[PDB]
Swiss-Prot record:
Phosphotyrosine modifications at: Y24
InterPro entries: Calycin, Fatty_acid-bd, ILBP, Lipocln_cytosolic_FA-bd_dom
N-acetylcysteine: residues bearing it: C6
SUPFAM superfamilies: Lipocalins
Organism expressing this protein natively: Homo sapiens (Human)
Gene: FABP4
Domain-level remarks: Forms a beta-barrel structure that accommodates hydrophobic ligands in its interior.
Subunit structure, as described in the record: Monomer. Homodimer. Interacts with PPARG.
GO aspect biological process, one term: negative regulation of DNA-templated transcription
Name of the protein in question: Fatty acid-binding protein, adipocyte
Main location (coarse class): cytoplasm
One MF term in the entry's GO annotations: fatty acid binding
Similarity comment: family membership: Belongs to the calycin superfamily. Fatty-acid binding protein (FABP) family.
Alphabetic keyword roster: Acetylation, Cytoplasm, Lipid-binding, Nucleus, Phosphoprotein, Transport
Length: 136
């Protein structure tokens, strides 16, 4: 297999900035204790591609999580805050667009390359949080 555009996401990433994440978690429905502990965390994100399968791992003092998926194909995901969601991830003009559905609710997580950073935008019902990662 040759190179793919999504190889731009591959690597080891560390959180360097976070904005409005507590308000995003509130809108998602995360409880007080989980919001406080999750808000302290500085995750490392490890992204790899093998054939059609993309794997995103998050390692932190709060939780270690991992998803593997094929673009456009729905999968089960247990989130760091212990939601059991149905997830679909697609590539839209270079942006990984991740929709999570649960309990009649929906949230969208976008992952984009900007300069040498990986920018994550989390959106729920008018509330956005921006989390910026740099290469580890
Ligand atoms: C609603 N709850 C919630 C939602 C998103 C989280 N994290 C991320 C998810 C996707 C892409 C990126 C991130 C990131 O963390 O940037 C976390 C979280 C996961 C691990 C540690 C801390 C928070 C939590 Cl709890």
């Amino acid at each position: 297999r040759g190179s793919h555009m999504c190889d731009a996401f591959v690597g080891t990433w560390k959180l360097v900035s976070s904005e409005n994440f507590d308000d995003y978690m509130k809108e998602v429905g995360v409880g007080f204790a989980t919001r406080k502990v999750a808000g302290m965390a500085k995750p490392n994100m490890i992204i790899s591609v093998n054939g059609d399968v993309i794997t995103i791992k998050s390692e932190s003092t709060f939780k270690n999580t991992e998803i593997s998926f094929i673009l456009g194909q729905e999968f089960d995901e247990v989130t760091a805050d212990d939601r059991k969601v149905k997830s679909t991830i697609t590539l839209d003009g270079g942006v990984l667009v991740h929709v999570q559905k649960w309990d009649g609710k929906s949230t969208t997580i976008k992952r984009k390359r900007e300069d040498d950073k990986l920018v994550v935008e989390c959106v729920m019902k008018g509330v956005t949080s921006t989390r910026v990662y740099e290469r580890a």
